């Protein structure tokens, strides 16, 4: 029996790394409130109501979230689907017209604009007639083209923009990723998983956990938080161009609002097309803001400073600065709240210093009605105003940082907020996953023959 | 409680267990391999890619001596330079992931030898039944 005869085996558990498309699976509970309310309530399969992970044993798979392909497929799929949820809505070509604007009725102090009362001609249901109509636009949407002044919208120089139908909600619903046939999805479970390298306790799973898609720049919200302690993640920490993601342990709470009691008003641009304009401000003119608890925020910065001293030496001076500059929605804090896009100045959180040994922070917010997210060539959208005072409450899951330094050996390490690419917001929720391909045909020796 | 044995009858549970214990639960990876307007095209294309991969593997298994068998036996001997390890350590110690990355260079040679073996077996069977 010194001879060994080769035997094949079909259905052997052994995988090799590969990349493929993944189909999304939204939960069927969103189907109970039907009729296109959020996206992918029609363009998405319902889930298995019985998810079943299968904890493996004595197994080591190398994970690397930075060279992952699933985050890139998600960044493509959200853009393509977000464009697919604007084509039935009304294009706002005819509203791009010369505006005659004045100040809103207010005790103007001679130091702020921030609202404009713009009258303009507009077509009617019939093609022949026309109507004078007034609206209220923000100052970040009108530009003085060169008596009362004479303005135009800012998108008119490059591209007309579809407004969003108010039957379509902007709020996230959890998106699962069920793997197709032939492939599988692994999952790290090590609580001290750095981000790159071996995770010595993996678990295969047929469909991923609840991923709610938020859109935010300075500090990501409602993001699955780590369990044992606050963690930081990077690719090369001694590199400057790569962001330094941070995931919290305790969710610090933020409250945001808009005190102006609006009045939504319908204008018929064309037959079958209606335009929604900010009609009147009853109540009082009060600026939008956000509040976090000062004590918990000082404690949470104490935790992240305790964590950052490991990678940099125990005797360094970690200090936090505000953003260096750039466009609007990378310096300020961008998010959506009830279907209306805020931009909140965050210099009031990011100023401190840290040496080796009740109230609440207010921070102002500015609002745009038109938005250009993902920075395409000729697509913006006009987010319509919403009736009444709105507010929304959110847990802060983590924040995105950025180190800087040129030379001259100083002990300080100034950190500033980041943003930039939208993909970093997804790399804080697809870090523990990896897609694999089954190769079920393996071959091995044993003692047997086949009988002729 | 569910029980830890439900791990082994589960999908891919034997991936860390030894090679002598994955052969009992080897049919679950075989069974869960097949079944499981732009989005319709993506999902349709992925599903037909999966069934083309399964059909390619069944055709490559059928031109050997085992068209519908999970376990099989052949008629070609192991060159000793392939893995030079005895029987007890490659069926009680090693895992399949480690075994796949120890013979990864020699696999096309094995497939060619199996094709030659089945071809000569077919012509020998035809010569045996030709005389009757």
């Amino acid at each position, epitope marked *: 029996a010194e001879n060994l005869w080769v035997t094949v085996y079909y259905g052997v558990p052994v995988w090799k790394d590969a990349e493929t498309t993944l189909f999304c699976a939204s939960d069927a509970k969103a189907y109970e409130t039907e009729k296109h309310n959020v996206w992918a309530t029609h363009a998405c399969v319902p889930t298995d109501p019985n998810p079943q992970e299968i904890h493996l044993e*004595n197994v080591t798979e190398e994970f690397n979230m930075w060279k992952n392909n699933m985050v890139e497929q998600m960044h493509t799929d959200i853009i393509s689907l977000w464009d697919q949820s604007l084509k039935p809505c009304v294009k706002l070509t005819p509203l791009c017209v010369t505006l005659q604007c004045t100040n809103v009725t207010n005790n103007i102090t001679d130091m702020r604009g921030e609202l404009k009362n713009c009258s303009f001609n507009m077509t009617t249901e019939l093609r022949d007639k026309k109507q004078k109509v007034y609206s209220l636009f923000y100052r970040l949407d009108v530009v003085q083209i060169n008596s009362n002044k004479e303005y135009r919208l800012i998108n008119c120089n490059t591209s007309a923009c579809t407004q969003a139908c108010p039957k379509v909600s902007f709020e996230p619903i959890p998106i699962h990723y069920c793997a197709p046939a032939g492939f599988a999805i692994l999952k790290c479970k090590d609580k001290k998983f750095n981000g790159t390298g071996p995770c010595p306790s993996v678990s295969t799973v047929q469909c991923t956990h609840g991923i709610k898609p938020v859109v935010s720049t300075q500090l990501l919200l409602n993001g699955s938080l780590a369990e044992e302690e606050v963690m930081i993640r990077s690719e090369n920490i001694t590199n400057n161009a790569k962001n330094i993601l941070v995931q919290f342990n305790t969710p610090v709470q933020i409250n945001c609002t808009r005190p102006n009691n609006n009045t939504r008003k319908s204008i018929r641009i064309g037959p079958g097309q209606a335009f929604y304009a900010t009609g009147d401000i009853i109540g009082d003119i009060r600026q939008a803001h956000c509040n976090v608890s000062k004590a918990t925020w000082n404690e949470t910065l104490g935790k992240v400073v305790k964590q950052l001293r490991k990678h940099f030496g125990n005797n360094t001076i970690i200090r936090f600065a505000n953003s260096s500059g750039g466009d609007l929605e990378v310096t300020t804090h961008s998010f959506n709240c009830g279907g209306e896009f805020f931009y909140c100045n965050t210099s009031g959180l990011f100023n401190s210093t840290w040496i080796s040994n009740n109230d609440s922070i207010t921070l102002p917010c500015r609002i745009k009605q038109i938005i250009n997210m993902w920075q395409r060539i000729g697509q913006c959208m006009y987010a319509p105003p919403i009736q009444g005072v709105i507010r929304c409450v959110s847990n802060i899951t983590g924040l995105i940082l950025t180190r800087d330094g040129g030379s001259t050996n100083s002990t300080t390490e100034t950190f500033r907020p980041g943003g930039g690419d939208m993909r970093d917001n997804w790399r804080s929720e697809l870090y523990k996953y990896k897609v694999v391909k089954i190769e079920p045909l393996g071959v091995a020796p044993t003692r047997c023959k086949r009988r002729v | *409680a569910v029980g830890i044995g439900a791990v082994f009858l589960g999908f891919l549970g034997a991936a860390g267990s030894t090679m002598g214990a994955a052969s009992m639960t080897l049919t679950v990876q075989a069974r869960n391999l097949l079944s499981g307007t732009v989005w319709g095209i993506k999902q349709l294309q992925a599903r037909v890619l999966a069934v083309e991969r399964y059909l390619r593997d069944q055709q490559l298994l059928g031109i050997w001596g085992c068209s519908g068998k999970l376990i099989c036996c052949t008629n070609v001997p192991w060159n000793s330079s392939w893995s030079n390890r005895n029987l007890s350590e490659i069926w009680d110690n090693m895992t399949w992931l480690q075994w796949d990355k120890e013979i990864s260079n020699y696999t096309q040679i094995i497939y060619g030898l199996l094709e030659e073996s089945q071809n000569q077996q077919e012509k020998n069977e035809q010569d045996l039944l030709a005389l009757d």
Partner: antibody
Amino acid sequence: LQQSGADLVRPGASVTLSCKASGYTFTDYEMHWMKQTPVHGLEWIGAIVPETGYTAYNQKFKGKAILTADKSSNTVYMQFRSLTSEDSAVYYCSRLKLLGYFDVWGTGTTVTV
Amino acid sequence: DVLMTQTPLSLPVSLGDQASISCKSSQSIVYKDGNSYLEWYLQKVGQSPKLLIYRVSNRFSGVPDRFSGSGSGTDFTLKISRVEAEDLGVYYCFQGTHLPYTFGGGTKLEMKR
């Protein structure tokens, strides 16, 4: 339901503690192990399927805890390695059914380090 | 890991009142069966721990009907109808789906005077 007794263990010593199964067959039932700590309460350790011969553990206790079983005599052996003074707890044999509950339970073999 | 907590931690309840303790699950506990595999444990002091009920609804044989349990996948609780002296002990919540199997903290029902 048959067990070992309590021990007096030095730090850094490898001790094998058994509870042997009597009456019920090894092909049907599957054991587990436990810890009764006065701070963390109860914790899970591991398991044995004696037919297949290898299962997993709790990820804190891999390496230290190794579980072997002799199916002929039906004697189920733990093995610990490099014990600490923290392992003063009560260790419980337990029995499971497939998709099933805990049938029997051991009294306990305290390891006073 | 799917560790749980127990709210509250100790209830001295008189002989003949209703006691109710909850365990909250981080991840959902759903198997391919559909039934949420959670067990309720009681342990009288110096003994082996028993089983109070099964999943949410079924009951361990050899246990009286002074125990009831409720839950809807995410957060679970009990209701004890009448209190005895044997109902002294330490209670636990146990999971049965994912590895490693987690426990609750442990509650000690006491007397009132």
